[PDB]
Symmetry: C2
Subunit: 494 residues, 2 copies
Amino acid sequence: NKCDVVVVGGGISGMAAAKLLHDSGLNVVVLEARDRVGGRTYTLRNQKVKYVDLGGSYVGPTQNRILRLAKELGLETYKVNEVERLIHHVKGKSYPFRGPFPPVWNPITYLDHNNFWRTMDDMGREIPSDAPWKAPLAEEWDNMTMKELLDKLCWTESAKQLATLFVNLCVTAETHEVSALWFLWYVKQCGGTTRIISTTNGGQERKFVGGSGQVSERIMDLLGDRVKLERPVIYIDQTRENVLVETLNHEMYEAKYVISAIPPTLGMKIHFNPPLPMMRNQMITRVPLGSVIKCIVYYKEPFWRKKDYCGTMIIDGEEAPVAYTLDDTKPEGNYAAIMGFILAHKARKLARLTKEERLKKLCELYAKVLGSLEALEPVHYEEKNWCEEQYSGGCYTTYFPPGILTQYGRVLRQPVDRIYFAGTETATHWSGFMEGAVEAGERAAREILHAMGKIPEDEIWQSEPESVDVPAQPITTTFLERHLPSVPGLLRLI
Amino acid sequence: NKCDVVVVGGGISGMAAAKLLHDSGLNVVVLEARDRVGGRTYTLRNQKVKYVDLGGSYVGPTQNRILRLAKELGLETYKVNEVERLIHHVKGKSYPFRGPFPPVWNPITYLDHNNFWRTMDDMGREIPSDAPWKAPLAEEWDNMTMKELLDKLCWTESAKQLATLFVNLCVTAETHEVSALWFLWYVKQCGGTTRIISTTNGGQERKFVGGSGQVSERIMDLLGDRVKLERPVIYIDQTRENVLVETLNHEMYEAKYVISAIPPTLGMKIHFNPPLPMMRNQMITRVPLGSVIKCIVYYKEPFWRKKDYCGTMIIDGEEAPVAYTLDDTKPEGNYAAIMGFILAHKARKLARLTKEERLKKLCELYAKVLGSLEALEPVHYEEKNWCEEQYSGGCYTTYFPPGILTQYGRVLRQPVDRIYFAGTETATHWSGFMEGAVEAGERAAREILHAMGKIPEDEIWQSEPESVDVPAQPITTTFLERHLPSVPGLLRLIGLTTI
Ligand SMILES: *[C]C1=C([C])[C]=C2C(=[C]1)N([C][C]([O])[C]([O])[C]([O])[C]OP([O])(=O)OP([O])(=O)O[C][C]1O[C](N3[C]=NC4=C3N=[C]N=C4[N])[C]([O])[C]1[O])C1=NC(=O)[N]C(=O)C1=N2C#C[C][N][C]1[C][C]C2=C1[C]=[C][C]=[C]2
Ligand SMILES: *[C]C1=C([C])[C]=C2C(=[C]1)N([C][C]([O])[C]([O])[C]([O])[C]OP([O])(=O)OP([O])(=O)O[C][C]1O[C](N3[C]=NC4=C3N=[C]N=C4[N])[C]([O])[C]1[O])C1=NC(=O)[N]C(=O)[C@@]13=N2C3#C[C][N][C]1[C][C]C2=C1[C]=[C][C]=[C]2
């Protein structure tokens, strides 16, 4: 019935918010809509797989908040397998390689690729992480889609295809679907193009021993019976002295403050009294999530390592169900598996199939790309279609279509009276990742702390010490990369 | 507690659905979230204004369903004043004219304007009204915004600037916010560019004597206490023998079937058991409504008629709060007023102002454009900002961004078990209008009737006899209009005759 702060949602952001408030002696209640905590993280357990991450899973250098939080909960990381060669599959042939970027040999193409990533990053530097709507050319950039920008920038089909894959892989949306300004912000606020794409030395380096879902689970363990499962919030009343929150089962909670720790658009599932301010009212109808099926095929052995492949595959073209894969074998070398994503529109198309039909396409595919009959002999299969999730809306995160970010961006984490906003969407570093989920939950927690005079203003946003277990090497560019002309730069010079 | 059909929402669509079901002896309940019926229609009454439509209001030729429905309810129409000259205000000057299109003299500009509207309509003909994702070039047209298309098509700033206002005016969104395919569909499904834009002989011709809100109010009168106000639906359970609907106040209804008659995106306010099928799950996060403030300034007289202006103004350029206006005087010639819309991003920006600050800007604006100091002397002011409405989400209707429509369009009116879908967004003729709202409610009603074996499949979609009070002239094109080259067509013809 009564407490200091009601937290709506038990994902990493909610749980992190609850923890920080509870470690300050406050009385918190987490209202979670599902019969489990974790949200967009979800670790499944059975005999066959032991455990498997079916949502959020990967963490890496510069992601210091999730690393710290998880360590404090007694969790450990291991490195994702990247010892042997990666494969780029393009126009139906596999080209093995090392390093993080696939090499390109043709001189003109080389220049077009070099200049594209470099322009991605150049544009990023003019975009403030904590207010992108304040980039100098924000309207110009917000009013075009990432496809218009690709058509403009890429003088070769090679470079344009790879850049489309990247966009698809990062935001589980089509380049036609998103704003150039939002996506350029997104990449920027994760440290730029190198940092975001890398396995070794970028966001894909590591996973958690036992499952990322143990982050939320263990916090729910720490909070005891303060966490209420199967409590979907349906009403929020801020007209009286205290905030009143009603859940679907008819329970009623009272607090001094509320934290909304759910995807922005899911605020649509709550009725408000008084009505939300006009900007936020319309903002929450204009901000959808990506579309992705996460798919994990199991094998007797990690057969690919025999051929000196690591399990990473970058797979070009429309016919391929899966554009990207990683080795999902346990650190001990057993439960051998390949993880792959079915992205954006392909997630919509391939959902019409049965589970067993998708398993077939993915093995046929992996057989082609790996050049192994062994790939046609799977022992087990798990998959998750996040588009069907009522209390997610999609995965991995929220994207902004044309025109929206500059109009409604500001509103995202603006408090509405006594409601404060967390969720990975409201983060300013690694937004859309687990890392950003911790950042935004701890910040909203400290906003309420401050509103209660417990801390000064300067302490609301707080920096994080570099992990000692997963330290970060800095991003470096060679002299030519930085200075070689673009294709039109080379034409102007000719 | 129990009935045949629960209808969520008592807007024109819900009310028309309810009426058709109840006229077949079925037991219906309308669950309306607000303390009033009419939703996006809303007639305000007071001494100062008598009445005023603050939401939907206009009807005209080819809109036979609303015309019939309202007539049966004992309502009458009158013609919006269009007797004297219209004004096109561009680059700070007013250029009076007659006949629904502002004329253009410059022959190069004239060619670009001609070819733009004509191309709008040409592209229309390739898009099916009832399945626009089936256009031959659907993906290509759906993956680009309306502003990419205008950059491509318009060889003059003159034509591009007017075409932007047209889009802003029709869909209360920016050109860069919407799909080229969706917008082309939208215009097409209203009869094409002429039909849509016209006051005389197009959708803006008339209003209802007394207010459009009387349509829903009178249906509520006819239905008695079946209409339940302040019942926002929060829950729908379809796991058992009957459908269970729970409202926010904790009431519970049981029916054999449900009709959702609320903006598509507003289905997000309902919790579903079992979960929605995946396409519809995500469809509803992907389809937002426009942004408009509807504004009516009142004067002692309709002073503009004295100067031989009818009250219509097409006002170009970024400094103007209002891009379009219409004479709102009562048909008796009293309660003299001007109606104007603040569109799209202008509605966001000018909401930060106070009610009295916006009245100033509009008056100053009207004064420049009418060249009248009397414009600066208002007697009364009423405005509605529909962006702030929780149970609308915007006005006038729902728009589809780049890539959505071909991916999620099919889903819009697909039943989910025993839930059937109405509301104007689901209509295939005049979608976005009060007309579309009637079309889609009567169709959903008949869907349920058919599911109950009461009517054959062929009776689900039904045509409508032409109104005799508001008959429709057909749309005609001159020989040059149809055949003159475009700017690039004229360049290729100059190129061919030398090189
Ligand atoms: C889904 C997904 C997947 C499949 C994958 C991924 C992901 C996802 N990610 C993301 C994550 O997961 C996220 O971000 C997080 O988790 C977030 O969180 P938050 O914010 O907290 O939220 P959530 O979780 O959702 O939760 C919330 C809650 O709430 C609730 N609710 C609702 N509503 C309601 C409620 N309650 C009450 N009431 C009401 N009404 C719900 O239920 C929930 O629970 C990720 N992340 C990271 O970090 N990592 C990873 O890995 C991930 N994943 C992935 C990623 C990928 N990456 C990639 C690879 C390759 C590449 C990339 C990128 C870039 C480049 C390259
Ligand atoms: C808002 C507006 C404005 C300002 C204007 C306009 C409009 C609007 N419009 C549109 C109309 O209004 C619409 O469409 C109708 O009304 C529809 O309806 P429906 O379908 O039925 O829907 P609604 O209304 O919304 O209703 C529903 C209901 O539901 C409810 N809910 C929610 N949620 C819930 C509920 N319940 C329970 N539960 C829950 N959960 C609500 O509350 C409601 O009630 C229009 N239309 C027409 O026809 N006309 C007119 O006039 C109108 N307006 C305008 C127009 C304009 N036009 C223009 C001028 C010039 C031009 C144009 C266009 C083009 C060219 C040129």
